[PDB]
Design a protein around this ligand. Sequence first.
Ligand SMILES: OC[C@@]1(O)OC[C@@H](O)[C@@H](O)[C@@H]1O
Ligand SMILES: OC[C@@]1(O)OC[C@@H](O)[C@@H](O)[C@@H]1O
Ligand SMILES: OC[C@@]1(O)OC[C@@H](O)[C@@H](O)[C@@H]1O
Ligand SMILES: OC[C@@]1(O)OC[C@@H](O)[C@@H](O)[C@@H]1O
Ligand SMILES: OC[C@@]1(O)OC[C@@H](O)[C@@H](O)[C@@H]1O
Ligand SMILES: OC[C@@]1(O)OC[C@@H](O)[C@@H](O)[C@@H]1O
Lengths: 87, 89, 88
Amino acid sequence: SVQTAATSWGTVPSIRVYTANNGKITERCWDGKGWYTGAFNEPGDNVSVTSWLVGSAIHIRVYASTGTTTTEWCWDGKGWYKGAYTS
Amino acid sequence: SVQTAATSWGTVPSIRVYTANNGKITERCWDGKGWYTGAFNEPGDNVSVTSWLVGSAIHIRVYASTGTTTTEWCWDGKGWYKGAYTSTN
Amino acid sequence: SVQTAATSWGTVPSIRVYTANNGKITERCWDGKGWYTGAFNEPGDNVSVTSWLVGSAIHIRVYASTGTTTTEWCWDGKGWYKGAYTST
Ligand SMILES: OC[C@@]1(O)OC[C@@H](O)[C@@H](O)[C@@H]1O
Ligand SMILES: OC[C@@]1(O)OC[C@@H](O)[C@@H](O)[C@@H]1O
Ligand SMILES: OC[C@@]1(O)OC[C@@H](O)[C@@H](O)[C@@H]1O
Ligand SMILES: OC[C@@]1(O)OC[C@@H](O)[C@@H](O)[C@@H]1O
Ligand SMILES: OC[C@@]1(O)OC[C@@H](O)[C@@H](O)[C@@H]1O
Ligand SMILES: OC[C@@]1(O)OC[C@@H](O)[C@@H](O)[C@@H]1O
């Protein structure tokens, strides 16, 4: 089966759900008005996520794994980028 | 192995642990005074969860997957119900 | 593939990432100034985690599963220990 990870923030809330499906991770988003496909698109068979706020600014970290390789993907409001995480 | 997902809220805290075992997801609850089996029961092989507070009110969302179908289940204080979540899979 | 779980707290933030690989769960840590290996080391094939702050103090619960048995491991600042969690 597909494998998911979820995070949320605030009271509306905002929710992000990441799904690993046949080696591809995609993202679905809720901000109070319906679900849509987010910007996140990266390879992986496994996903986890965490997020935190600084004021009202969200910071998301997605950990994508294929075999024994885990890559951290980062969002701070302006595009996804690879983080410094190493195993 | 069985697959779990966990969430917590507050500082006591309250904890909810969802376990997918042989296609069924069940819930175990902690509110500071021992574990007990909760009201959540849905089919699935994979599970994730998130939760948030609005003042003192807890809201939980559980994402249950079987094959490529993921269903969202919602708790807003008065029973579990199916949410609007969908995914293009 | 390996399976991970992640938690974070505060605004720095602190992050903990747990990886289940070859039946062992290990932990990598971030507190704002580089990644390092954490104290957590327990058996498991599946992992989930949650954490909460009590003032400035972190409390972590890791749920490690092997077969149909899930064990809860607890951190309250002074070593990891098995918690009271049980399933069915
Ligand atoms: O507004 C939607 C969005 O920008 O929210 C933050 C991140 O989840 C992004 O991947 C996503 O596209
Ligand atoms: O800004 C990116 C970064 O520094 O954010 C905190 C952690 O997620 C790090 O691994 C990551 O490289
Ligand atoms: O008080 C216990 C309970 O109502 O808490 C909220 C949800 O976790 C429910 O499934 C659960 O039965
Ligand atoms: O009240 C239910 C609901 O609106 O809550 C926010 C999201 O979880 C939605 O998918 C869901 O339908
Ligand atoms: O400072 C690192 C550390 O003590 O943080 C709390 C827990 O994550 C521990 O396993 C970890 O070694
Ligand atoms: O201090 C340990 C403990 O009481 O913490 C709260 C829950 O995680 C319990 O299962 C656990 O035994």
